[PDB]
Design a protein around this ligand. Sequence first.
Ligand SMILES: *[C@@H]1O[C@H](CO)[C@@H](O[C@@H]2O[C@H](CO)[C@@H](O)[C@H](O)[C@H]2NC(C)=O)[C@H](O)[C@H]1NC(C)=O
Ligand SMILES: *[C@@H]1O[C@H](CO)[C@@H](O[C@@H]2O[C@H](CO)[C@@H](O)[C@H](O)[C@H]2NC(C)=O)[C@H](O)[C@H]1NC(C)=O
Ligand SMILES: *[C@@H]1O[C@H](CO)[C@@H](O)[C@H](O)[C@H]1NC(C)=O
Lengths: 49, 50
Amino acid sequence: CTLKSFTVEKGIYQTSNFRVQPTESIVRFPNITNLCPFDEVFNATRFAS
Amino acid sequence: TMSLGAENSVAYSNNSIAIPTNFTISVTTEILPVSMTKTSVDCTMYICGD
Ligand SMILES: *[C@@H]1O[C@H](CO)[C@@H](O[C@@H]2O[C@H](CO)[C@@H](O)[C@H](O)[C@H]2NC(C)=O)[C@H](O)[C@H]1NC(C)=O
Ligand SMILES: *[C@@H]1O[C@H](CO)[C@@H](O[C@@H]2O[C@H](CO)[C@@H](O)[C@H](O)[C@H]2NC(C)=O)[C@H](O)[C@H]1NC(C)=O
Ligand SMILES: *[C@@H]1O[C@H](CO)[C@@H](O)[C@H](O)[C@H]1NC(C)=O
Protein backbone atom coordinates (compact mmCIF):
# COMPACT_ATOMS: atom_id res chain seq x y z
CA CYS A 1 0.00 0.00 0.00
CA THR A 2 2.85 2.39 0.85
CA LEU A 3 4.83 1.71 -2.33
CA LYS A 4 1.61 1.69 -4.45
CA SER A 5 2.62 -1.59 -6.08
CA PHE A 6 1.55 -5.22 -5.82
CA THR A 7 5.16 -6.42 -6.16
CA VAL A 8 7.71 -5.39 -3.54
CA GLU A 9 11.43 -5.61 -4.26
CA LYS A 10 13.96 -6.85 -1.72
CA GLY A 11 14.86 -4.27 0.90
CA ILE A 12 13.74 -2.37 3.98
CA TYR A 13 10.81 0.03 3.63
CA GLN A 14 9.55 2.66 6.05
CA THR A 15 5.78 2.11 6.07
CA SER A 16 4.08 3.77 9.05
CA ASN A 17 4.62 4.89 12.64
CA PHE A 18 3.49 2.67 15.50
CA ARG A 19 1.83 4.65 18.28
CA VAL A 20 -0.05 3.33 21.30
CA GLN A 21 -3.62 4.66 21.49
CA PRO A 22 -5.24 6.10 24.65
CA THR A 23 -7.33 3.76 26.77
CA GLU A 24 -9.72 6.14 28.55
CA SER A 25 -10.44 9.86 28.83
CA ILE A 26 -9.77 11.64 32.14
CA VAL A 27 -11.17 15.13 32.73
CA ARG A 28 -9.66 17.12 35.60
CA PHE A 29 -11.46 20.33 36.64
CA PRO A 30 -11.48 22.17 40.00
CA ASN A 31 -13.72 20.49 42.58
CA ILE A 32 -15.19 23.80 43.77
CA THR A 33 -18.72 24.34 42.47
CA ASN A 34 -20.59 27.62 42.95
CA LEU A 35 -23.58 28.60 40.82
CA CYS A 36 -22.32 31.48 38.79
CA PRO A 37 -24.23 34.79 39.15
CA PHE A 38 -25.26 35.21 35.52
CA ASP A 39 -28.77 36.04 36.76
CA GLU A 40 -27.51 39.30 38.29
CA VAL A 41 -25.92 40.45 35.02
CA PHE A 42 -28.52 39.22 32.53
CA ASN A 43 -31.81 39.70 34.42
CA ALA A 44 -31.14 43.09 36.06
CA THR A 45 -33.86 45.75 35.88
CA ARG A 46 -31.46 48.61 35.11
CA PHE A 47 -28.30 48.75 33.00
CA ALA A 48 -25.69 51.47 32.86
CA SER A 49 -25.23 53.87 29.97
CA THR B 1 44.80 45.04 6.13
CA MET B 2 45.57 41.32 6.21
CA SER B 3 48.93 40.09 5.00
CA LEU B 4 48.77 37.60 2.16
CA GLY B 5 52.07 35.98 3.09
CA ALA B 6 55.64 36.63 4.04
CA GLU B 7 57.53 38.27 1.21
CA ASN B 8 60.10 36.01 -0.45
CA SER B 9 62.16 36.96 -3.51
CA VAL B 10 63.40 33.99 -5.52
CA ALA B 11 67.00 34.48 -6.65
CA TYR B 12 66.42 33.71 -10.30
CA SER B 13 69.34 33.76 -12.69
CA ASN B 14 69.89 32.14 -16.05
CA ASN B 15 72.65 29.72 -14.99
CA SER B 16 72.05 28.90 -11.29
CA ILE B 17 69.94 26.14 -9.76
CA ALA B 18 69.02 25.33 -6.17
CA ILE B 19 69.29 21.67 -5.22
CA PRO B 20 68.03 20.29 -1.89
CA THR B 21 70.65 18.66 0.30
CA ASN B 22 68.21 17.32 2.90
CA PHE B 23 64.58 16.46 3.43
CA THR B 24 61.82 16.60 5.99
CA ILE B 25 59.29 13.80 6.34
CA SER B 26 56.16 15.85 6.93
CA VAL B 27 52.91 14.31 8.13
CA THR B 28 49.91 16.58 7.65
CA THR B 29 46.28 16.14 8.63
CA GLU B 30 43.34 16.35 6.24
CA ILE B 31 39.89 16.15 7.80
CA LEU B 32 37.05 15.29 5.44
CA PRO B 33 33.38 14.81 6.37
CA VAL B 34 31.93 11.56 5.04
CA SER B 35 28.39 11.23 6.39
CA MET B 36 25.78 13.19 8.30
CA THR B 37 23.29 12.36 10.98
CA LYS B 38 20.57 10.20 9.46
CA THR B 39 17.28 11.86 10.35
CA SER B 40 13.74 10.58 9.97
CA VAL B 41 10.71 12.79 10.56
CA ASP B 42 7.22 11.55 11.33
CA CYS B 43 5.28 13.98 9.15
CA THR B 44 1.90 13.35 10.81
CA MET B 45 3.23 13.63 14.37
CA TYR B 46 5.33 16.73 13.61
CA ILE B 47 2.50 18.61 11.91
CA CYS B 48 -0.39 17.36 14.05
CA GLY B 49 0.88 15.62 17.19
CA ASP B 50 -1.84 13.54 18.84
C1 LIG C 1 71.74 31.77 -3.87
O1 LIG C 1 72.39 33.02 -4.17
C2 LIG C 1 71.51 34.16 -4.13
C3 LIG C 1 72.34 35.35 -4.54
O2 LIG C 1 73.55 34.95 -5.17
C4 LIG C 1 70.88 34.30 -2.75
O3 LIG C 1 69.88 35.32 -2.83
C5 LIG C 1 70.02 36.31 -1.79
O4 LIG C 1 69.59 35.83 -0.50
C6 LIG C 1 69.72 36.80 0.55
C7 LIG C 1 69.32 36.11 1.83
O5 LIG C 1 67.91 36.18 2.03
C8 LIG C 1 68.87 38.03 0.23
O6 LIG C 1 69.06 39.01 1.25
C9 LIG C 1 69.27 38.60 -1.12
O7 LIG C 1 68.40 39.68 -1.47
C10 LIG C 1 69.18 37.52 -2.20
N1 LIG C 1 69.61 38.05 -3.49
C11 LIG C 1 68.83 38.05 -4.57
C12 LIG C 1 69.43 38.63 -5.81
O8 LIG C 1 67.68 37.61 -4.54
C13 LIG C 1 70.21 33.00 -2.32
O9 LIG C 1 69.77 33.09 -0.97
C14 LIG C 1 71.18 31.82 -2.45
N2 LIG C 1 70.51 30.58 -2.11
C15 LIG C 1 70.87 29.82 -1.07
C16 LIG C 1 70.07 28.57 -0.86
O10 LIG C 1 71.79 30.13 -0.32
C1 LIG D 1 69.46 16.44 7.51
O1 LIG D 1 68.58 16.92 8.54
C2 LIG D 1 68.51 16.09 9.71
C3 LIG D 1 67.48 16.73 10.62
O2 LIG D 1 66.32 17.12 9.90
C4 LIG D 1 69.90 15.98 10.34
O3 LIG D 1 69.84 15.09 11.46
C5 LIG D 1 70.38 15.72 12.64
O4 LIG D 1 71.81 15.49 12.78
C6 LIG D 1 72.39 16.10 13.95
C7 LIG D 1 73.87 15.82 13.89
O5 LIG D 1 74.21 15.07 12.73
C8 LIG D 1 71.72 15.56 15.21
O6 LIG D 1 72.25 16.22 16.35
C9 LIG D 1 70.21 15.78 15.13
O7 LIG D 1 69.57 15.20 16.26
C10 LIG D 1 69.65 15.17 13.86
N1 LIG D 1 68.22 15.41 13.76
C11 LIG D 1 67.33 14.43 13.56
C12 LIG D 1 65.89 14.85 13.48
O8 LIG D 1 67.66 13.25 13.46
C13 LIG D 1 70.87 15.43 9.31
O9 LIG D 1 72.19 15.38 9.86
C14 LIG D 1 70.88 16.31 8.06
N2 LIG D 1 71.78 15.76 7.06
C15 LIG D 1 72.56 16.52 6.29
C16 LIG D 1 73.42 15.80 5.31
O10 LIG D 1 72.56 17.75 6.38
C1 LIG E 1 -35.78 37.65 36.48
O1 LIG E 1 -36.36 38.89 36.97
C2 LIG E 1 -37.79 38.86 37.13
C3 LIG E 1 -38.20 40.24 37.59
O2 LIG E 1 -37.22 41.22 37.24
C4 LIG E 1 -38.17 37.77 38.13
O3 LIG E 1 -39.59 37.71 38.24
C5 LIG E 1 -37.63 36.43 37.65
O4 LIG E 1 -37.92 35.42 38.61
C6 LIG E 1 -36.11 36.51 37.44
N1 LIG E 1 -35.60 35.24 36.96
C7 LIG E 1 -34.44 34.72 37.37
C8 LIG E 1 -34.06 33.40 36.76
O5 LIG E 1 -33.73 35.28 38.21
